[PDB]
């Protein structure tokens, strides 16, 4: 039963799950991720000792291993001069526990699964497609993500521009660092990138570095429900251009990875 809260900031976001990399040159690197199973939680491939906590606790929890997306390669296009290259910046860490479900940690709906099709209310005939219409129509989509603001968690709402407006959005991609000189933005724009930021239908609070790996979310029908996870954006905010974009991976977009890393979760994948 995922995508669910009770009557606190992990009371109120109880999927999330801050990331800290402790590397041997001094600087601690901040991530975020999502409680997706009892064993495991789902961030981005670019944050990578490694310190992991859910439920707002001080307590680290062992890890038994961090897959990565095959096709994840940050190097993959220093031949044609993109210093980073964010395709399917995704990320699994499995836990050598069991999680305990509480009413501070508990897990966030995935596309294409059954908790998804029950937390929508959609029949059980219900298609991965069908999924996909509901969540992310083509249009602007009301969303948002979780950021740490003085050491709590807060939601900031965010639109995603998969209509009219997405174009417009994923053609801001050539002010990012190191895209300037960039001919062709689908070089750098894959078709697994969801695109949120700027002005336009709202003024669109921007990600930091450390909310990287953080779920970007749907709240329909009372739930929650993972669209895509935080992984790049234009400008560092942290004047605002209206230019700054964020860009996500969407996780319809790695179905058949999700599918065979999570498939003994009991998610109930289509
Ligand atoms: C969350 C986040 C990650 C990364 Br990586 C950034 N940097 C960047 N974008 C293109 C090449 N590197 C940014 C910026 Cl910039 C703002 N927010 C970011």
């Known amino acids: 039963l995922c995508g669910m809260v009770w009557e606190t900031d992990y009371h109120k976001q109880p999927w999330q799950a801050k990331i800290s990399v402790i590397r041997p040159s001094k600087g601690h690197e901040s991530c975020m991720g999502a409680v997706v199973s009892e064993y495991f939680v789902l961030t981005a491939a670019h944050c990578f000792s490694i310190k992991v906590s859910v439920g707002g606790e001080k307590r680290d929890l062992e890890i038994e291993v961090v897959l990565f997306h095959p096709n994840y390669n940050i190097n993959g296009k220093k031949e044609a ?3 980073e290259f964010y395709d399917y910046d995704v990320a699994l860490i499995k836990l050598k526990n069991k999680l305990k ?7 966030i709906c995935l596309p294409c699964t059954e ?14 497609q069908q999924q996909k219409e509901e969540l992310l129509p083509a249009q602007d989509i009301k969303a948002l993500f979780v950021s740490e603001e003085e050491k709590k968690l807060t939601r900031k709402e965010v639109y995603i521009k998969n209509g009219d407006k997405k174009g417009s959005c994923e053609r801001d991609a050539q002010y990012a660092p190191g895209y300037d000189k960039v001919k062709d933005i689908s070089e750098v724009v ?22 990287s790996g953080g779920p970007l979310i749907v709240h329909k029908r009372s739930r929650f429900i993972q669209v895509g996870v935080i992984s790049w954006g234009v400008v560092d905010v942290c004047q605002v251009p209206a230019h700054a974009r964020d860009f996500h991976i969407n996780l319809f977009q790695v179905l058949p990875w999700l599918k065979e890393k999570l498939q003994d979760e009991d998610l109930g994948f289509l």
């Open 101 to 107: 479900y509480g009413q501070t940690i508990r897990p």
């Open 81 to 83: 001069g993109i210093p």
């Open 190 to 211: 894959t078709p697994r990138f969801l695109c949120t930021g700027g002005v336009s239908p709202y003024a669109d609070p921007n990600t930091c570095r450390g909310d």
């Open 115 to 128: 908790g998804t099709t029950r937390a929508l209310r959609l029949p059980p005939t219900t298609t991965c």
